[PDB]
Design a protein around this nucleic acid. Structure first.
Lengths: 99, 82, 126, 208, 155, 100, 103
RNA sequence: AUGUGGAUUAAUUCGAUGCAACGCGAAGAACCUUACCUGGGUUUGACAUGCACAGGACGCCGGCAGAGAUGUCGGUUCCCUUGUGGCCUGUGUGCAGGUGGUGCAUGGCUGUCGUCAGCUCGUGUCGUGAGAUGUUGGGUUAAGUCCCGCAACGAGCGCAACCCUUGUCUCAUGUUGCCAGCACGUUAUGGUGGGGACUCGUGAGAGACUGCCGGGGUCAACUCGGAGGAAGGUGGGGAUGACGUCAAGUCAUCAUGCCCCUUAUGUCCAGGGCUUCACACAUGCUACAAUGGCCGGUACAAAGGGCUGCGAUGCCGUGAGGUGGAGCGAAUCCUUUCAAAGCCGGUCUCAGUUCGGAUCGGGGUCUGCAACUCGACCCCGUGAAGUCGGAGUCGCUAGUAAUCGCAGAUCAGCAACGCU
């Protein structure tokens, strides 16, 4: 058949799962074939830092910017559904690669 | 070491000045500010001088001074002992 | 089908335990092809040693993760758990030597200010 | 490093980010945009005090939000100062500034606003005793102030000394992870020099 | 250990024979975590013993342990301007530990071009009653005979 | 650091953005193959005619807020001090204190 | 080990006419005279350069090696002499303590 | 190998100072950084803004004098709409700036005693008062955790615990990864369909609560050996700094009260330095060998990095290296289908040695405009000290120590053997 693949990127797991359910819903609204957010890995961009100025290199701290990622493969891309899913609304925290 | 595909580092100032000089055919003491310029055997005629952070040093040239930089012939630090 | 797992410090192995002979096959090879380490062989054998059923139950493995000794402990673990699927009645005599537990002892986080896990820099007093 | 910020430590769980977006190559860009934003904001308006500043970014929209209990001082009443704000924000080029201005509910259980008001009182000509005491009273008479700690420091009352004396009341268990905490660190001018202020406000727990 | 001891470890057995004195020995010669290397060194030395005296090497090893395994040893304590040594009975665990420690570390400073020879022939020496291990054991017993006088502290 | 020094690094970025766009690139392109006119190019001696500032080695990743010319993290694009301070104020997405 | 007394002279920023060295080397041999377990002596000259001093203009820390414990003596005064002699006395206090705690 | 002390020095920028500094501020000092020195220009300036007066073009692209700063021709000579402005040319007026001083003027941030178990308040009773009481005394604890009798009754900030990671299991979840049951490619192979079954990556919840046993125990706590379990007696390690001292450190990350520069301690410029050494102190590694040196053959980990960049295969070079670019914002692709110890075969046969690699003379590579002070790297020859270490000291109680190698923030390339 045919596919259209979405790769969702975020930092909030609650919200990436929220928009996952929302997008799966809006894909289901057309009776169009829907699969689900497969549990695929997440990057972890990590950065160690020192706390204080001018000395005390032994005291440090860590920080960890994760990257929540979800693949959603939509089968049966009826072009009505395609141009509908082109026009979902979301808040700011999530970004999406439509390919 | 200067790579060979790049060739030498002969810098424009003294390269063009010494073009002018050998086309005058005349040789005199000539000052320059570049330690980082590499040496050609075409310098065995002229006398070059360089600055070292305090003042200038002149130096006369010899056959086996080729492939080198002029800073190698300037004393940059003085250590007479304790 | 019969399938159980073994994991020791990032050393995972799956197992097929069949009622045949004791034929060992470990990723296109056997226990005498890999593992030139006899203490490791003892580990690998200790469950069948325990039940006295050495050469009563074929085993087929797929090694991945960890190094040889981690893989070894995971192997013997999975073989014992498969024997428990064969029959649990022998289990409370296997806890008598405890050849059944996952090794709850993994490598440690490396800390800051120091040289590794617990080796501190030389507290110099000059 | 005697006590890290409860906001920065509960950030993973109980308190929430002040600038929500997603970016990969534009991250550096968005942060420098954001700091130039907030700096021009505070440099323009300082007479009524900002309570919170939040930002969000989208494909093309940009949502900047500013909480302050006294809007009429801050905003263009006719639209003057708010349009000035859009002007600065278009120089910095957010390009679609849906500037949703908001007034908070409880000016006396808003930690930063309370510290800023007390800091202004100090910076004018005043002592710190009555200001601290009345701050405690004004906060604690309201419902949700379960515990407070108000911590004033500096050359207090002109005493040429690095001093530190605080007034608290109630329950301030900063180690109670599940509970909402509000923190405010604000530094105020004075004739002699600069004073610091910190305030912790405890608020119930959170179940969820 | 201001609160109490911890249990001593669940030691392994020898894979081949069934005497954990062997693994005690290999763990005490173990050097930079090379256990299988020390182990093949062990097996080679033991096979030398078997092919050089026609016996099972573990028995002659027990023989050498019986030779050098002390009962009485020293324990020091600084008291009153002249720090005293004191005789102490020594339980089996520490006895065996110390005997094997002597045996290994004095096999180390021998002159055979190779550890498999130094070790094995030192074992032969301590077995049949000649080695530097036995020498140091006698030195220690003579020291206990010396400082018999100070047992009465009872420590 | 200083106003003047931040201004000068900003100037140098403008120079580089101008001239390493194509001017300080074509000489590299032609002078990397061994078919080059190096034997009579004087393109090396011509790259000596361009300003030294044409080269990017003189740049440095300074912070945008302070100008600390050290301790700089390209992902945040900031001095480590300001990095600490932002993540302390909870002003960067999904950033927090972790363990493992 | 008598010229083995590892003098370490130090001053972060103070005008140092060459007699501080004389005074200090001699005031160190002073206590070399009666303790033979000594390797290093660190000697430091420091100064707060604050307007309206709190009667602490010059400051001195001295620290000395020994077989096991080390010796530690701090003093503070308005000039070189009061501080050096005071630190010398405090060294002697530490050292007398240690040599009474030897036998 | 690096970091300091002292002395050289035209300049060797500044600070940090036993515990709590010395592989420190550095997470990459050739120029740049850099704050320091010789020499040159600048002076409302390297970049702005408030005034008015004289401006309508100002820049940018190439040329010349020039170490560069800097001054100078050729081409750019606006859109407003009559009131003036974007803009920049000057004139000076407000000036603008400082890495100049006070961290004992301040704030903020941080280390430290110390992740040690404590430190305080209410109201009371006692005391003329400073203050006591509670918080004393037994059991008991990792601990002011808990119980019992009492001028104390009560409480907070703490210790515990809801956080993360790991340790086990039920269900789903099916690729960019597994691939047992099946059919098809066969030189490289899950490589392709096909099964989500085991793995599994990501999330939710049960599981440890002395849960129950019986003997001890103010019968209270507190324990002693059990079952069951993946873990059992705060599973383990993490995060977390009670009030404050050391006037702890940073006016040079930053912020800033006060004092000073202003024709200059500001400021633009190229060269040089921060890598000087008859020495001292400290941190580490590489060694003093047969568990070892050398060639060749065979298998596996975790793990992350990536676009005006990571770079594959082919071939050529000894080998660093190379046109070239497949594929790649990346569970795929570069990341050999990812390694070193180790294993198998053989030599070296205990000695300044096939140990060890300094050190130098030359042959060369890459990046950078530029490798002399001053960069890393391969190759040839080079072959030094070192034959197990002094009085004392340092770190370590389990997946620890000791050892092998990998990966990387910073970074064009580097002293990175450091740090994580």
């Amino acid at each position: 058949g045919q596919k259209i693949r979405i790769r969702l990127k975020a930092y909030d797991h609650e919200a990436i799962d929220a928009s996952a359910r929302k997008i799966v819903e809006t894909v289901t609204r057309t009776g169009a074939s829907v699969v689900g957010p497969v549990p695929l890995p997440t990057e972890k961009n990590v950065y160690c830092v020192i706390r204080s100025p001018h000395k005390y290199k032994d005291s440090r701290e860590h920080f960890e910017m994760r990257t929540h990622k979800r693949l959603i493969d939509i089968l049966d891309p009826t072009p009505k559904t395609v141009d509908a899913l082109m026009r979902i609304d979301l808040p700011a925290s999530v970004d999406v690669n439509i390919q | 070491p200067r790579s060979l595909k790049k060739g030498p580092f002969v810098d424009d100032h003294l390269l063009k000045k010494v073009d002018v000089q050998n086309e005058k055919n005349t040789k005199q003491v000539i000052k320059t500010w570049s330690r980082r310029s590499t040496i050609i055997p075409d310098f065995i005629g002229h006398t070059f001088a360089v600055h070292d952070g305090r003042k200038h040093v002149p130096v006369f040239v010899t056959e086996a001074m080729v492939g080198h930089k002029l800073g190698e012939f300037a004393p940059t630090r003085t250590f007479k002992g304790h | 089908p019969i399938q159980t797992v073994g994991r020791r410090k990032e050393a995972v192995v799956r197992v097929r335990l069949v009622p045949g002979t004791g034929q060992f096959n470990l990723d296109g090879r056997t226990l005498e092809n890999y593992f030139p380490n006899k203490v490791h062989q003892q580990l690998i054998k200790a469950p069948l040693v325990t039940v006295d059923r050495v050469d009563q139950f074929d085993i087929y493995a797929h090694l991945d993760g960890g190094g040889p000794s981690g893989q070894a402990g995971a192997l013997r673990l999975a073989i014992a758990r498969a024997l428990i699927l064969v029959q649990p009645e022998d289990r409370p005599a296997l806890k008598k030597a405890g050849f059944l537990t996952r090794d709850p002892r993994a490598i440690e986080r490396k800390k800051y200010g120091l040289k590794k896990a617990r080796k501190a820099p030389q507290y110099s007093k000059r | 490093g005697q006590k890290i910020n409860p906001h920065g430590f509960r950030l993973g769980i109980t308190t929430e980010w002040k600038s929500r977006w997603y970016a990969d190559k534009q991250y550096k860009d968005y942060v420098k945009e954001d700091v130039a934003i907030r700096k021009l904001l505070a440099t323009g308006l300082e007479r009524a005090g900002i309570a919170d500043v939040e930002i969000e970014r989208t494909r093309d929209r940009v949502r900047v939000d500013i909480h302050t209990a006294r809007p009429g001082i801050v905003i263009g009443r006719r639209g003057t100062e708010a349009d000035r704000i859009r002007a600065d924000l278009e120089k910095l080029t957010g390009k679609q500034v849906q500037l949703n201005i908001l007034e908070v509910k409880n000016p006396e259980s808003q930690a930063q606003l309370v510290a800023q008001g007390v800091a202004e009182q100090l910076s004018n000509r005043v002592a710190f005793r009555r200001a601290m005491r009345k701050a405690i009273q004004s906060a604690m008479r309201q419902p949700n102030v379960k515990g407070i700690r108000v911590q004033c420091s500096g050359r207090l009352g002109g005493a040429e000394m690095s001093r530190s004396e605080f007034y608290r009341e109630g329950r301030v268990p900063l180690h109670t992870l599940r509970a909402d905490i509000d923190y405010g660190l604000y530094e105020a001018k004075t004739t002699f020099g600069r004073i610091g202020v910190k305030v912790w406000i405890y608020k119930g727990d959170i179940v969820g | 250990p201001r609160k109490g001891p911890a249990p001593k470890r669940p030691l392994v057995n020898d894979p081949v024979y069934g005497s954990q004195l062997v693994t005690q020995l290999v763990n005490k010669v173990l050097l930079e975590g090379k256990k299988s290397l020390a182990e093949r060194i062990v097996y080679g030395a033991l096979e030398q013993a078997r092919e050089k005296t026609g016996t099972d090497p573990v028995v002659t090893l027990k023989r050498a342990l019986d030779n050098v395994k002390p009962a009485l040893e020293v324990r020091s304590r600084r008291v009153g301007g002249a720090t005293y040594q004191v005789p102490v009975e020594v339980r089996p665990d520490r006895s065996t530990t110390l005997a094997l420690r002597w045996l290994v570390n004095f096999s180390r400073q021998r002159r055979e071009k190779t550890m498999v020879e130094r070790l094995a022939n030192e074992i032969l020496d301590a077995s049949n009653g000649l080695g530097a291990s036995v020498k140091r054991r006698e030195d220690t017993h003579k020291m206990a005979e010396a400082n018999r006088a100070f047992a009465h502290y009872r420590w | 650091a200083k106003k003047s020094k931040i201004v000068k690094n900003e100037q140098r970025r403008e120079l580089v953005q101008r001239y390493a766009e194509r001017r300080a690139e074509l000489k590299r392109t032609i002078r990397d193959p061994a078919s080059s006119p190096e034997r009579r190019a004087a393109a090396v001696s011509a790259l000596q005619r361009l300003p030294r500032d044409s080269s990017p080695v003189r740049l440095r990743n300074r912070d945008v807020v302070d100008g600390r010319p050290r301790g700089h993290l390209r992902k945040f694009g900031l001095s480590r001090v300001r990095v600490r301070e932002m993540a302390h104020r909870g002003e960067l997405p999904g950033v927090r204190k972790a363990s493992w | 080990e008598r010229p083995h007394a590892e003098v370490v002279v130090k001053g972060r920023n103070v005008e140092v006419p060459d007699h501080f060295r004389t005074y200090v080397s001699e005031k160190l041999s002073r206590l070399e005279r009666f303790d033979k377990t000594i390797y290093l002596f660190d000697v430091e000259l420091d100064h707060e350069r604050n307007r309206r001093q709190r009667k602490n203009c010059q400051h001195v820390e001295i620290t000395a090696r020994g077989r096991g414990p080390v010796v530690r003596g701090e003093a503070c005064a308005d000039s070189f002499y009061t501080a050096f002699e005071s630190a010398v006395q405090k060294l002697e206090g530490r050292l007398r303590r240690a040599k009474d705690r030897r036998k």
